[PDB]
Each structure stands twice: as C-alpha cells, then as structure tokens.
C-alpha cells in the first residue's frame, strides 16, 4: 500500500491463501468462538473480504496479487476454496505433463482461465 501510494503498480505474492484461512480458524478456536460449517471460523467470509478488498486499482496506483491456492481433499465446494474463488479474477494451472515435454512455463492452456 505504501508503494501503491507512490503512484506505482505493485505485485503482492501470497505464499498460500489456505494457511491464512487456517490461522484464522486456529485464532477463532483459541478465543472460544462458536465454530461454523465444516469447523471453520464464523468470520470466514469477513476475514477473507478484509484482506482481498484492499488489493485493487485506485486513482493513484494499483496492487495486483498472485496467490498460491491449496484445495482440501480435492473438494472445490469446501468453504475455504469456495470463499477464495469469489475474489479471484484469473486461474493459472501448472501441469506436470506439460513440464515432462520440455515446455516451460508449464501452464495448461485448457484448464487455466480468466474473467478478463
């Protein structure tokens, strides 16, 4: 946000957005709050919104974010993936098969998508 306010376009890399959700679940349990669906914190959507709504394009500059995503039990309907996908604008999928052919970067042009 300081670099954005200097009039720049900035990249914010988040090592794993699932670990941010889990840290919120752990803190919520330590504070004694009543758990929600699948055992997540009752504040799941608000905690994601407070972080994701600051990453935007403004009149001064912008912050673009690349976030690594982990899907629990390969279930795309789980509350963590389901809450995260509401904020994403693009999906880049890396393929082990494409890397085996010697092509780099190993993006899958068929599975990867963008709202743009």
């Amino acid at each position: 946000e300081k670099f954005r306010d200097e009039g720049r376009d900035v990249l914010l890399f988040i090592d794993n957005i699932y670990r941010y959700t889990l840290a919120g679940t752990e803190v919520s349990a330590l504070l004694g709050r009543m758990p929600s669906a699948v055992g997540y914190q009752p504040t799941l959507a608000e905690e994601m919104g407070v972080l994701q709504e600051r990453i935007t394009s403004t009149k001064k500059g912008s912050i673009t974010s690349i976030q690594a995503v982990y899907v629990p039990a390969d279930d795309l309907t789980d509350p963590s993936p389901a809450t995260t996908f509401a904020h994403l604008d693009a999906t880049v999928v890396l393929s082990r098969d494409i890397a085996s052919l010697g092509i780099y970067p190993a993006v899958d042009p068929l599975d990867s998508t963008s709202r743009q």
Binding site: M34, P35, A37, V38, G39, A73, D75, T77, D78
Partner: protein, 269 residues
C-alpha cells in the same frame, strides 16, 4: 444413509471401468487378426472367378442354371455397438422391394442373435448354424450353403443374397446385401468333361463368398465391440464423477454434525 455406501459404489464402478478400458484394446487386437484372415482368403476367390469367366465365354455349348434368371450373418455374443440392429433394419429395405414385386422369401441364419431375431417375429428358417468361434472354418458353412443352393436348383428361389456387415473403416461397420448365385485367345485342355468342371467350380465359388462375408462380419464385430467398450469406459467415468460430488457433501455434513454434537456437550459440562 451416508459416506460409507457411496464409497463402496465408487470402488465397484472404478474396478469395472479399468477392464472396459483394457478390453477395448483386446477387441482391437482381435480386429487385426480378423483383418489378416480377410486378406488371406482373396487369391482363391478371384482365381475361381477368372476360371469360370473364360470357361463359360469359351464354351457357349452349356449355360449353368446359376448364369440365367437370404443368408444372414450375425454374432453369437454381447457388446455389439448396434452391429446386428443396423443389419436387420436394412434387410427390411430390400425385402420391401420383394413385397412390391410379389416374390416369396426363404431365410438361412448364421449366429445366435440372428436366430433369436427371426424366432421373435415368426420368420421362416430354411437352415441355421450357431456358436461358431471368433476364427471360423469354411467346412462348418457347407451345410447351410447347400440347402440354399438346392432350393435354387429345385426352382424354389429366383435370386439368393448374403446379408452381412462390410468393413468401411475401423470406426464404421456398413450393413450390406450381396447377390450370390446369379453372376478370348486360347482354350483349356479339359481332362474330365467341362460340365463336371463348371458345376464343381461354381459350388466352391459360392461357398468361398459366404465364408468371406462371415470373416468380414467378424472383423466388423471386433470393431463394433471396441466402440461399445470405449463408450462403457466413458459412461462409468461420468457416474464416478457424480458419486464423488455426493460423497463430498456427506464428508462436509459429517464434520459439521460431529462439531455440533461436541460443542453442545462441552457447553453442558
């Protein structure tokens, strides 16, 4: 009930999907064995046709009854991708021409699914053979072929045809009807009488054409079986994907319910 029954259904369908994927290649392997057997029998039929052509042109002294004016091939087993149905559907098209012409029909049947078809509609069977191996032998066809040849010599049949599938390509089996009985510088040195030679060669010619129709239908069957097992493998994959979605719902419900019973129990203590 819950997650346990769904997990058992998935495992059962997953085991079946693996063999239908493998059996598709087993059918392709058997398709290639049938295709080499189709080619191996051609030199004999074409030379018999070359001999009869000259031996009839050069000898205007005698005209065989076969030179002046249905045998149905079907499978003995399951997994056929519409092979027998497309053939029976087509037989009616040529029979319709016979109904407009007012002509009578005699039928010969090769294979168990063909016998089951005519038996379910009241079709008049003059001869029938079944339970032949995937690699048949011409000596089993002699019986069924002779009854149909005799009916021609007795004047009971005006024209005879062989109904079978033709191998257009590895993805296409075509239903067909082919006429069997009604078909220059030197002369041959006949040891026996020419009538005996022409009469003997014409019998070998028709038997050879019926055998080639049977072997080409078996190549079409293995090609149809490949498509059918490919489709079964693909169809099972859609069922497993849907059952995985139902399982995930039960996984989330079990975790939510256990926590709701646990939180209620700790609030009372």
């Amino acid at each position: 009930a819950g997650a346990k029954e769904i997990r058992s259904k998935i495992a059962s369908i997953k085991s079946t999907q693996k063999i239908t994927n493998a059996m598709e290649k087993v059918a392709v392997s058997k398709m290639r064995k049938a295709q080499m057997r189709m080619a191996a029998g051609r030199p004999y039929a074409e030379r018999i046709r070359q001999v009869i052509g000259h031996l009839a042109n050069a000898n205007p002294e005698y005209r065989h009854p076969f030179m002046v004016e249905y045998i149905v091939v079907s499978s003995d087993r399951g997994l056929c991708g519409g092979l027998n149905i497309n053939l029976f559907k087509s037989l009616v098209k040529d029979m319709s021409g016979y109904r407009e012409q007012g002509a009578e029909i005699d039928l010969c049947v090769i294979g168990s699914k063909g016998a089951s078809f005519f038996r379910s509609f009241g079709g008049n069977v003059v001869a029938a053979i079944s339970h032949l191996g995937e690699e048949p032998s011409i000596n089993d066809l002699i019986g069924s072929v002779k009854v149909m040849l005799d009916a021609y010599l007795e004047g009971r049949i005006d024209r005879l045809f062989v109904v079978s599938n033709k191998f257009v390509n590895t993805m296409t089996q075509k239903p067909t009807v082919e006429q069997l009985i009604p078909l220059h510088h030197w002369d041959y040195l006949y040891e026996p009488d020419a009538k005996s030679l022409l009469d003997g060669l014409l019998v070998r010619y028709v038997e050879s054409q019926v055998y080639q129709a049977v072997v080409e239908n078996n190549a079409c069957e293995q090609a149809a079986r490949m498509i059918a097992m490919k489709n079964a493998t693909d169809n099972a994959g859609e069922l497993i994907s849907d059952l995985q979605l139902i399982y995930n719902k039960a996984r989330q419900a079990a975790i939510t319910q256990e926590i709701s019973e646990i939180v209620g129990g700790a609030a009372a203590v």
